[PDB]
Each structure stands twice: as C-alpha cells, then as structure tokens.
C-alpha cells in the first residue's frame, strides 16, 4: 500500500473524518475498526481521541487497501495516518475501537490491529474494562 496526501476538513466521530483528497471533500470511514457511536459508552472518548490525533498533526495521509475504496454510502475506506502514526491502530491499542468489518481483500493491516486489540484487552483499557 501507499500513503497519499489529504488535508483535514473536520473530525466527525471516532471512526469517520472528513478530509480533502485529490482536491475534493470526502468523508472517510476508518478500515478494520468500529468505534462506539457518540451516544454510546466510550463514544465521546473515541471521538475526542480521533479529533486530537488528526487536528494536532502537521499532516494527515490516507492509505487505501487493495479492494474497494468507497462503501455503499460513498464514504472513502482507508487507513489514516497522522504524522505517520496510524489512527486506526492507535484507536484499537487504546481500547477505543474493536477490530471489525474485516472484509477479505481489504484487510492488509488486520494482524497489526489484532495484536493492538490483544494488548488493549490485556490492559483492560476502556471498552475492555
Ligand atoms: C468499515 C466498513 C464499513 N462498511 C459498511 C458496513 C455497515 O453497513 P450498515 O450501515 O448497513 O450497518 C456500515 C458500518 O459503518 P458505521 O460503523 O460507520 O455505522 O458501513 C463497509 O461496507 N465497509 C467497510 O470497510
Ligand atoms: Ca461506528
């Protein structure tokens, strides 16, 4: 996979971010994770985590997988990096997202994220507490 440029427009919630990509506004949904909704437990905390990460970065980048690049809602499906740190992995590692929606052909980082989730579960963090 390859990282491509994007510019933050707005952090929406724990697993969706609006960003400009190839000069057009896109809503991106993070691959391989599921954060709680804002009105659910840890929802506000996931939203804040993702917001801080993307807002504080000097740059964000998007990385598409090998498969589908948009979902049925027209959201971009990507791994998002904030100053080179993956948001999808960071959320899982802090127990603010579960590994989820693992579709074959768009699952390059599945094992990386499963290892993060095991660590968050061992530490009883957040969703795992
Ligand atoms: C993460 C992801 C979600 N989706 C679709 C499946 C779910 O459809 P349904 O809306 O029918 O439940 C929805 C979950 O997104 P959210 O967790 O943002 O609600 O997004 C994909 O199709 N591919 C993906 O890789
Ligand atoms: Ca969600």
From Swiss-Prot:
Residues 109-129 are annotated as: Disordered. Residues 109-125 have a biased composition (Basic and acidic residues). Ca(2+) binds at residues 15, 34-35. The active site is at residues 29, 37, 75. Disulfide bonds: none annotated. It comes from the Bacteria. This is Nuclease A. The gene is nuc.
